[PDB]
Amino acid sequence: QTNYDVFEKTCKELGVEYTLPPLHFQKVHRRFLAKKALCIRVYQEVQKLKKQKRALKAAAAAAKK
């Protein structure tokens, strides 16, 4: 926050990685970590289906043209 140039050199030379403090604390327990894993997986599946649909829709339009 004061001397960024010295900060960059110090971290590079000393080999220290600096991670910024996260804005919000995340609670962790078996029920949360298991629901959060499904929620991420469900989203990914929904988005994968949309991408496939777009490719098929575009492919059909290209053939018509």
């Binding site: 926050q1 004061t2 001397n3 960024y4 140039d5 900060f7 910024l20 804005l23």
Partner: protein
Amino acid sequence: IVRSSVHAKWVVGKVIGTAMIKTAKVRATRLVLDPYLLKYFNKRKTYFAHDALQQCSVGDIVLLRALPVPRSKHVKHELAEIIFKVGRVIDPVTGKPCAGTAYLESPLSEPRE
């Protein structure tokens, strides 16, 4: 060249995040009077701002300009200026680099580098 509808035509805040593409999450704070205590406290608001050049870093004070048309649901401002860069502040009064309450370059000197 009509201006925005939003009340915050000009807002100052701190860049609390920069993980979205070309967008910087900025936390502005205003003073609100507690009616019971008659004392002012800090009410903070989050503003998404269009950072076209991705020139923003977490912790730097910035000035946002209200966009004439909202770019998206939440992006209704753009990055006008970076008032203070994080760790790279330049004293407005003298114009010399500073690192806290100290001069990295003396104001007596004229480096012109």
